[PDB]
A paper describes a structure:
The B. theta protein BT0984 was the founding member of GH139 (BT0984GH139) and is specific for the α1,2-linked MeFuc in chain B(6). BT0984GH139 specifically cleaves α1,2 linked MeFuc in partially digested RG-II but cannot access this residue within the intact polysaccharide. However, once the preceding arabinofuranose (Araf) and rhamnose (Rha) residues have been removed, BT0984GH139 can efficiently remove MeFuc from isolated chain B. BT0984GH139 exhibited no activity on 4-nitrophenyl α-L-fucoside (4NP-Fuc) but displayed activity on 4-nitrophenyl 2-O-methyl-α-L-fucoside (4NP-MeFuc). By 3 h the anomeric signals had reached equilibrium. These data indicate BT0984GH139 produces β-MeFuc and performs cleavage with inversion of the anomeric configuration of the α-MeFuc linkage. In BT0984GH139, a triad of Trp residues, W162, W403, and W490, lines the putative positively numbered subsites, providing aromatic stacking interactions for sugars within the Δbt0984 oligo. D723 forms hydrogen bonds with both N412 and N729, at distances of 3.3 Å and 2.9 Å, respectively, suggesting it may fulfill the role of activating N412 to function as a catalytic base. In BT0984GH139, the amide side chain of Q411 is positioned 3.5 Å from the catalytic acid E561, and could fulfill the same role as N421 in AfcAGH95 upon substrate binding. Surprisingly, overnight endpoint assays revealed that only one mutation in BT0984GH139, E561A, completely inactivated the enzyme. Based on these data, and with comparison to GH95, it appears that N412 and E561 function as the catalytic base and acid, respectively, in an inverting catalytic mechanism.
To date, family GH139 is the only family known to be able to degrade α1,2-linked MeFuc, making it essential for RG-II metabolism and a feature of RG-II-degrading bacteria. In this report, we present the 3D structure of BT0984GH139, alongside its homolog SDT91673.1GH139 from Verrucomicrobium sp. GAS474, an organism isolated from forest soil. Crystals of BT0984GH139 formed in space group P212121 and diffracted to a resolution of 2.7 Å, while crystals of SDT91673.1GH139 formed in space group P 6522 and diffracted to 2.05 Å, providing good quality electron density maps in both cases. Both proteins adopt a three-domain architecture, consisting of an N-terminal β-sheet domain leading into an α-helical domain composed of a core (α/α)6 toroid structure. GH139 enzymes operate via an inverting mechanism in which we propose that N412 functions as the catalytic base and E561 acts as the catalytic acid (BT0984GH139 numbering).
Author numbering: 21 to 178, 184 to 325, 346 to 610, 622 to 802
Write the structure that this text describes.
Amino acid sequence: QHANVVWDTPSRNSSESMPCGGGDIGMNIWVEEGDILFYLSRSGTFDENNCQLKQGRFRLRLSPNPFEDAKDFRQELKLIDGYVEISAEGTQVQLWADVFHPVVHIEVINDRPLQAEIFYENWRYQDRLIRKGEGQQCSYKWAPPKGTMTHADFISLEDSKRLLFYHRNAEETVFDVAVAQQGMNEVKSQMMNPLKNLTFGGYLSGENLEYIGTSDSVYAGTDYRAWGFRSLKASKKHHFSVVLHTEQTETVTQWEQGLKTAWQRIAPQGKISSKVVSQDKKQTRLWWNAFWQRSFIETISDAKDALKEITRNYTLFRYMLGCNAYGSVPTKFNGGLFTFDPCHIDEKQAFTPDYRKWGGGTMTAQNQRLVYWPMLKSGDFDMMPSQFNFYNRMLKNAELRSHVYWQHEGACFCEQIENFGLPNPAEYGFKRPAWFDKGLEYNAWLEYEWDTILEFCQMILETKNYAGADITPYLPLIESSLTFFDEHYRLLASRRGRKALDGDGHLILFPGSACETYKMTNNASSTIAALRTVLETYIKVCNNEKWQKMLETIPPVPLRYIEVKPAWKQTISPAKSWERINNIETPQLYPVFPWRIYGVGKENLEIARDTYFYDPDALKFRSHTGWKQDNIWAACLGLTEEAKSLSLAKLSDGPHRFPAFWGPGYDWTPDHNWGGSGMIGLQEMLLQTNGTQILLFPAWPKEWNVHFKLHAPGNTTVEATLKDGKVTILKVSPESRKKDIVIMIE
């Protein structure tokens, strides 16, 4: 038992919008001065500058409008069935997306016959020059070449099919620019190109509609054109469909064809088969019903109000993640699929609705990982490949890097990575010395940060461990990723000295970095904990000995002493050595999470706790904002009250009307690494794994009553309840695992 989001009065602007999606599609939906407005974003729609374009904005007006000064207004997110419902006296509108097909549906049911106008609004009707600061939404960031523009869409007026909109990419894209910049033209002809000719759009369609002409205005400081359709005859029912298609094609004909094929499915002889759309609808709702059975964290005086808040928000976010199961590319951290008009976020950055900070086809690994990690314990295993394929798609490209720059095998996956496997052109350096290594970013924050891929590698393996997933398509990726660290730091040492290993026969991890925070490291704890834990884990799943050899070559995690404001405390060191500090991450707790070397029910917990409580960089960097993992670590170290405080802070209502729209923090709104991280935190307070143990309530307060169900390794599922400090229930499946449970509530 939980709660939907119910607004009983209309919304003022696009920031006061509601998420709704499914499949690879996300809509922001709201009602403003009697109009039903929805933005429509789909995963993977990257322009020639690698900006994530929204497909458009949709407007629905009824006449006489029952939403004008309406009594009994109600916009409701109907979680269980994954659809939004807007209703007022004798009218009921439903919006949903098919989970199994790229199609949005609007349904109107009126007691009396009403008239309906539907408008398709597109602000890319003509070329628009990228203004100062607008580059952040693309790969050029702060330095878009003079005369760089967002190219125009192709709208046109030709069954029930009415309107055709699409954007098409040219042959020349930021890919070709970046290939040149980083000197890989030699091997360009062997590289996957995600952007060349990439085309994406669809049909607006309905029965009982005529065209009512074009019209021009401004929505949120953004000029736009609108095409309008009006129903020939008033009617008790009205049904509109939007049908999308995405593809790289030699001609526009080829693309159109694929769109037609998708359109025919739902309109076999030109009309929208309400038989077919009923199956689609039924399927979709079952899927959502199943969705809310995979996992949950629910409740059962303002203490309870606050718990309800975070559990509610935890859930609302999970909905948002759900909207992009089966995306070809992952839910992005910086807005996801639910960006709105920038001006509501920052007036200095008031650009098109296609705008967000930190790029579109450009995705920072450290953020992306926080979106996905929580999908293991929530059982959302089928969504995670969206994230895995992103990297698998560019494995050949990331390898050709290492071939070109250092003539060795293995994939070089930079931190701020494009969808084509090279680092972001801007961060690589536009004004860089001729002599500098072509494989290295001319960058103080990013140089030698290649280790986040290993977190995704761990995710892949953990899908096997948690859900028996078939991960055969990924093994090459995992192997190539490890091969790099071995072949790189061997070669670097052999070029510098006579020995390629240290005197303990271990790898010499220099130059490295501990995330983006400690730079030019020797033997960072973060990178080590990773190689150790990935290899340990990949050994259990591969008899080959090359991997046990390499595990023996991994140096130990470095520790150190710190004085306390005497007495000395022993903590985890950032690294054996570093040159400087350029950020506010805390990679000396990466052995706590993600790699779970230290943690509850594991050795030397006192070391980790002291790192959390006394490392003065960690103290200084502690926070609940954005990606800050202090909430996670607190929980993994069994510090309730600390975890309680942070998780309260992290998951409490965001600044917009929908309460799980958090941001912008260090990123963009809706911040998804905010949600993601926050999920992780709540999850770890309840359930942790320690070998084959399942530790329940490791960092959960007695006075928080809870009913949850989370996953654990070996297709295991734990449903439990705490009430007035008693574990009143336990339902465990398979039952053989019930004896592995350890209750920790004291």
